[PDB]
Amino acid sequence: TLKSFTVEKGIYQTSNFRVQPTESIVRFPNITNLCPFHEVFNATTFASVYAWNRKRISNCVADYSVIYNFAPFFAFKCYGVSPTKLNDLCFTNVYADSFVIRGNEVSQIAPGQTGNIADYNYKLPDDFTGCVIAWNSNKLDSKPSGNYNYLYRLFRKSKLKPFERDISTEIYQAGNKPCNGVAGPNCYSPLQSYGFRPTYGVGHQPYRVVVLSFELLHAPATVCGPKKSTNLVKNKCVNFNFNGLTGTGVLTESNKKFLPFQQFGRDIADTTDAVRDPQTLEILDITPCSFGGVSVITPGTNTSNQVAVLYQGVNCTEVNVFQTRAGCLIGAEYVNNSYECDIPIGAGICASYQSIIAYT
Amino acid sequence: NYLYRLFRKSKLKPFERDISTEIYQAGNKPCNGVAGPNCYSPLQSYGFR
Amino acid sequence: QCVNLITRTQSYTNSFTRGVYYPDKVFRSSVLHSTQDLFLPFFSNVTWFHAIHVSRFDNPALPFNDGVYFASTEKSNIIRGWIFGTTLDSKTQSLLIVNNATNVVIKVCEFQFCNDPFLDVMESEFRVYSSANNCTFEYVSQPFLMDKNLREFVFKNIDGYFKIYSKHTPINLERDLPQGFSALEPLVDLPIGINITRFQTLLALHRSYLSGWTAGAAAYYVGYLQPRTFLLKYNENGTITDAVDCALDPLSETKC
Ligand SMILES: *[C@@H]1O[C@H](CO)[C@@H](O[C@@H]2O[C@H](CO)[C@@H](O)[C@H](O)[C@H]2NC(C)=O)[C@H](O)[C@H]1NC(C)=O
Ligand SMILES: *[C@@H]1O[C@H](CO)[C@@H](O)[C@H](O)[C@H]1NC(C)=O
Ligand SMILES: *[C@@H]1O[C@H](CO)[C@@H](O)[C@H](O)[C@H]1NC(C)=O
Ligand SMILES: *[C@@H]1O[C@H](CO)[C@@H](O)[C@H](O)[C@H]1NC(C)=O
Ligand SMILES: *[C@@H]1O[C@H](CO)[C@@H](O)[C@H](O)[C@H]1NC(C)=O
Ligand SMILES: *[C@@H]1O[C@H](CO)[C@@H](O)[C@H](O)[C@H]1NC(C)=O
Ligand SMILES: *[C@@H]1O[C@H](CO)[C@@H](O)[C@H](O)[C@H]1NC(C)=O
Numbered sequence: 110t111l112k113s114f115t116v117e118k119g120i121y122q123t124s125n126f127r128v129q130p131t132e133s134i135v136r137f138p139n140i141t142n143l144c145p146f147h148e149v150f151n152a153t154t155f156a157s158v159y160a161w162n163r164k165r166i167s168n169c170v171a172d173y174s175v176i177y178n179f180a181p182f183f184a185f186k187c188y189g190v191s192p193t194k195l196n197d198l199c200f201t202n203v204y205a206d207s208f209v210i211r212g213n214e215v216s217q218i219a220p221g222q223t224g225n226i227a228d229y230n231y232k233l234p235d236d237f238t239g240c241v242i243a244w245n246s247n248k249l250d251s252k253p254s255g256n257y258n259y260l261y262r263l264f265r266k267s268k269l270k271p272f273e274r275d276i277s278t279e280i281y282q283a284g285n286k287p288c289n290g291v292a293g294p295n296c297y298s299p300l301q302s303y304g305f306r307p308t309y310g311v312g313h314q315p316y317r318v319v320v321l322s323f324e325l326l327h328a329p330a331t332v333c334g335p336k337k338s339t340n341l342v343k344n345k346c347v348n349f350n351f352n353g354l355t356g357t358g359v360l361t362e363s364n365k366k367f368l369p370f371q372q373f374g375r376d377i378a379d380t381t382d383a384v385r386d387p388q389t390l391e392i393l394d395i396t397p398c399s400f401g402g403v404s405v406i407t408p409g410t411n412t413s414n415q416v417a418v419l420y421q422g423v424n425c426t427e428v429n430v431f432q433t434r435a436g437c438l439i440g441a442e443y444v445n446n447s448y449e450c451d452i453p454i455g456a457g458i459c460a461s462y463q464s465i466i467a468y469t
Numbered sequence: 470n471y472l473y474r475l476f477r478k479s480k481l482k483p484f485e486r487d488i489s490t491e492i493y494q495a496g497n498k499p500c501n502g503v504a505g506p507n508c509y510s511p512l513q514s515y516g517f518r
Numbered sequence: 519q520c521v522n523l524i525t526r527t528q529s530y531t532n533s534f535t536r537g538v539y540y541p542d543k544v545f546r547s548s549v550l551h552s553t554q555d556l557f558l559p560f561f562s563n564v565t566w567f568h569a570i571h572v573s574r575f576d577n578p579a580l581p582f583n584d585g586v587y588f589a590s591t592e593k594s595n596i597i598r599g600w601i602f603g604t605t606l607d608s609k610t611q612s613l614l615i616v617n618n619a620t621n622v623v624i625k626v627c628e629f630q631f632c633n634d635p636f637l638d639v640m641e642s643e644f645r646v647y648s649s650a651n652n653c654t655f656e657y658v659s660q661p662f663l664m665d666k667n668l669r670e671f672v673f674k675n676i677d678g679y680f681k682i683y684s685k686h687t688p689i690n691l692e693r694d695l696p697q698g699f700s701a702l703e704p705l706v707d708l709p710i711g712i713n714i715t716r717f718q719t720l721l722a723l724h725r726s727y728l729s730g731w732t733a734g735a736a737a738y739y740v741g742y743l744q745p746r747t748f749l750l751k752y753n754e755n756g757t758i759t760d761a762v763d764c765a766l767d768p769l770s771e772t773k774c
Contacts, residue, residue: 177496193476193495329678365756368703370540370704372545374544374546377548383545
């Protein structure tokens with residue numbers, strides 16, 4: 110500290126004692142109001158790809174783990190975001206699009222792809238941020254007679270724009286002559302039936318597809334992953350993260366009666382002195398961990414190399430140990446004799462070298 | 470021919486290269502070196518056209 | 519089914535020291551805290567509106583400015599909520615706050631609002647709006663118009679959030695804007711994120727069954743918040759018991 114190899118006799122304030130943080134405590138509100146993924150990925154009836162079902166998702170917690178464990182998935186391809194980071198990401202809106210297609214066309218549900226499904230039934234934009242999930246649905250959607258309730262659009266005048274749906278049943282006019290709204294040669298009804306049967310090849314078996322599209326807007330993002338309760342440890346110096354307010358301190362019991370709308374608490378000098386726990390509605394007195402001014406009492410290096418340490422303001426139980434009003438003095442022995450002051454300690458206590466003695 | 474590391478357990482340090490072609494565990498279930506559910510390959514190729 | 523039924527008259531009164539709210543969610547005890555925020559100035563000009571329906575369009579839409587202080591001495595059933603937005607038609611988003619006997623429904627959709635919107639009593643919203651499309655927000659909670667009693671609200675639209683503050687202060691024969699301090703507790707911080715420039719009060723009308731609606735009257739006070747610096751007194755229990763407006767008079771300026 111003194112930037113010299115020889116130290117003159119005296120007391121030098123050299124360092125600051127600190128109580129190191131031991132554990133990390135993160136307290137967040139109870140997980141609840143989970144997003145209804147269980148009503149999207151487990152529905153009694155799915156929808157035809159032409160009339161694909163869209164559910165808007167907002168104002169809820171997104172627990173993607175239930176989506177992960179719902180079924181074995183033929184594809185869980187995620188475009189523009191990794192699947193794992195989703196829980197730690199918060200999005201403004203999540204759109205869940207549900208439909209049934211044949212297995213061969215699952216590859217078509219991706220950005221930049223072409224086919225009957227991509228051009229005429231469901232289109233994803235080139236810059237799409239989201240995930241595509243598909244799983245086999247033979248038990249739910251296959252009948253031996255043939256399931257004729259799943260339809261697709263085979264004929265359309267122009268390609269679909271991204272996130273567009275056409276429900277029109279208008280007869281597709283492929284020829285110069287007007288159709289007149291009655292089926293006729295060169296006039297074909299656009300919606301064809303997916304005649305699913307249990308004995309079809311894997312390419313043609315029915316597959317249920319849910320497309321999750323995540324969008325961020327200027328509005329505050331209200332769909333974010335789970336919040337970890339962790340656990341609450343009191344009476345020790347732990348790094349606390351309470352509802353995004355971070356710090357480091359002991360959390361003692363509080364006698365302060367907060368009003369119901371208040372969450373934190375502040376000192377006269379605008380320093381946090383209290384907090385309300387989100388998990389349990391209790392008030393805790395945040396008190397920062399102990400600190401002290403480490404002062405080194407030493408005679409000249411010409412005479413001796415013994416030193417004594419004064420922890421300024423620190424009681425002796427919180428760190429040849431003597432308790433002074435200045436702080437805790439370690440390394441000097443109190444003598445009931447009184448001499449003149451050699452090295453000033455404070456509060457009437459002075460130190461001298463004879464070993465190092467401390468006296469009034 | 471150009472691949473990127475989609476998955477890794479931790480972030481890399483400056484000027485560090487990772488070429489380990491080991492499987493990544495994305496879920497609670499261990500993967501045991503075989504791909505399948507919630508087990509994905511870390512290296513994915515770019516669709517350059 | 520938009521019908522013009524409400525006529526409105528206006529007078530001017532004094533704000534006294536009404537309109538103070540808690541500027542944040544921080545517990546402060548036995549301190550003097552100076553904050554600069556959108557507050558209703560002390561002894562300011564507040565407009566008293568009387569809305570009368572007897573059994574032409576004479577109920578215009580009020581501006582919102584930087585936030586609105588609302589007060590009413592009426593019972594909880596006559597005034598049933600508010601409307602917020604810019605154009606108040608199907609082209610922009612709008613916020614509808616409707617209270618009833620059991621709960622409050624706050625809902626942000628693309629409402630095609632009527633010129634004179636009112637809830638008619640079952641309860642029907644066909645006289646409030648004709649259509650509501652592309653609805654993006656809904657929030658149902660316990661009501662804040664429950665049961666002589668002066669009800670005060672402060673609405674702010676700051677950085678995407680529709681901050682609503684409220685207080686229920688009983689009053690006697692004394693004028694509807696009383697003396698003393700009643701700090702407004704932060705009630706609902708709605709994450710809306712829409713543009714709000716105009717607002718209108720919603721009233722409830724009963725069918726007559728005999729002049730299709732029963733005659734009624736409602737009195738309410740509207741004041742406008744301004745960027746002002748206040749010095750609030752926090753007592754031992756964290757309640758704001760007193761405040762001084764720093765720009766009102768030299769004595770309060772010295773205090774601030
Ligand atoms: C008061 O408002 C609530 C909320 O809008 C009404 O309760 C809903 O009534 C509808 C009837 O269309 C039900 O489908 C909902 O399930 C109810 N929701 C809740 C949360 O209860 C209530 O009916 C209204 N009461 C009156 C008298 O108008
Ligand atoms: C999912 O579907 C199966 C099929 O019957 C049902 O048994 C199960 O309860 C469903 N789970 C949920 C969470 O809906
Ligand atoms: C949160 O969870 C705790 C512990 O289960 C419970 O006591 C409390 O009522 C819950 N709700 C709130 C709002 O704290
Ligand atoms: C309030 O405003 C009106 C017109 O805006 C004005 O005539 C009236 O004098 C004002 N009130 C006071 C107390 O000045
Ligand atoms: C609003 O509604 C119209 C028709 O109801 C629709 O064309 C438009 O895309 C909608 N916009 C949004 C943002 O939902
Ligand atoms: C809010 O609406 C008003 C009235 O139409 C308009 O003048 C103003 O520009 C709008 N603000 C924004 C940010 O769009
Ligand atoms: C504050 O709380 C205490 C303890 O409940 C109570 O006795 C006192 O009346 C309250 N008000 C004031 C102004 O101290």
